[PDB]
């Protein structure tokens, strides 16, 4: 009579997963190559999607961890004495100002919580509560946003969590310091409702539920067939 404590919901949907890896420079390049942006949604990591889409309604907090590693890029007039690098990590709640470039005014808002992290210490951590207007996130939504039966099917619903933007703080006159960002996302205190059958056909779109017709299982030689093989001899095979 064995215990059932590793199959529970909390121990099944509370494993940190790397859901985003990005790279951004510091001095040169086009402005869009000077920051890293990610929209929080559980619809692009196929493993995490398949584990979440096993239920219909979910209610959880968010614990997010950022891992940043930076180097010095090859070139001429390279830096020799840059003391340290300090990064800014910005959480943009739904319905909040969003920067469109580096050095934009929106980086200095008083409503977006920001973390200033100097490189070398432990990674920066943050936790966001259940930010929604409804009472639970819905993975599957059968309907439209507008009441006139027109719009986008199962999209632009209340399941909005926010954006995350990472940028450099140190202005670099000599050299360029390329950096890489890894995001680790975990739920806490998760509650799940209305279980569903696991999916069968591979995912094709990051926003739809579209699919190709796939066979129900793998082939077999015969209906009344088990392992026990036959070796081919003087008999009829």
């Amino acid at each position, epitope marked *: 009579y064995h215990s059932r404590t590793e199959s529970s919901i909390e121990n099944f949907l509370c494993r940190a997963a790397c859901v985003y890896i990005a790279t951004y420079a510091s001095a040169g390049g086009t402005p869009t190559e000077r920051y890293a942006s990610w929209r929080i949604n559980t619809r692009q990591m196929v493993q995490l999607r398949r584990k979440f889409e096993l239920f219909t309604y979910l209610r959880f907090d968010m614990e997010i961890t950022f891992v940043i590693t930076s180097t010095q890029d090859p070139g001429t007039q390279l830096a020799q004495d840059m003391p340290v690098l300090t990064h800014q990590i910005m959480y943009i709640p739904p319905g909040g100002p969003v920067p469109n470039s580096a050095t934009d005014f929106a980086w200095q808002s008083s409503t977006n919580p920001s973390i200033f992290w100097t490189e070398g210490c432990a990674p920066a951590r943050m936790s966001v509560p259940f930010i929604s207007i409804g009472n639970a996130y819905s993975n599957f939504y059968d309907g439209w946003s507008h009441f006139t039966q027109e719009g986008v099917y199962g999209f632009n619903s209340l399941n909005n969590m926010g954006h995350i933007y990472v940028r450099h703080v140190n202005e670099q006159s000599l050299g360029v310091s390329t950096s890489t960002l890894r995001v680790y996302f975990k739920p806490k205190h998760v509650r799940a409702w209305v279980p569903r059958p696991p999916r069968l056909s591979p995912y094709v779109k990051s926003s739809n539920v579209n699919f190709k017709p796939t066979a129900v299982t793998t082939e077999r030689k015969d209906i009344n067939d088990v392992g026990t093989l036959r070796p*081919v001899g003087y008999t009829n095979h």
Partner: antibody
Amino acid sequence: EVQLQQSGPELARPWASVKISCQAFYTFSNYGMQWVKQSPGQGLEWIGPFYPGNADTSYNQKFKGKATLTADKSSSTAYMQFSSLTSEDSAVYYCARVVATTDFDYWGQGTTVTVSS
Amino acid sequence: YIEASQSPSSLAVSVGEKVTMSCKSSQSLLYSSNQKNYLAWFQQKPGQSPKLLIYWASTRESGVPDRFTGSGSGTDFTLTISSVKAEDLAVYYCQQYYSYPYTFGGGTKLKIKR
């Protein structure tokens, strides 16, 4: 140490039947012969044997409904009939023959059947 | 079906060293009624006809030197060459003659390292 020979390489075309013969230099009592598919990308794949002294003719299941086999023991000639010839069926056909019940001791020569559409 | 996987890569060693390699099968290859392992060790000269070296995975073919020795029971099937040579440049197949489909292995070429 006995050799084994067969029809010969013809440069065929798609939708042109290619019957591959094969002679023999042993007896026809419970011994058998088969063929292999020499392709660099597809490795080696058998196609289908027939067993003199057993009246058992078998084919590969990827080629089921495509290839057949017909031969006469008194003729000592082993055809390998093939249908729906595509462009990728090119291979160096070895006529392997075995006097053991199940082995691959003896082998053929090789024939090129590369086609051009 | 019933198949087997060849060694991941070639020997890639210098000439003159005894080599031990393996061939993993995707299903059992022993007839415990006869205690028979239905598998043989193959070789094909590039440009010429193939020829096996060890059949039944326990006895070398008559006319083949003693250096090539195949062994193994169950799913695994190994082989040992007491002395690799530059005049055996060919592809080694670990083929199972259990039943049709008479599928082959993957092949083991002797590349150049000297």
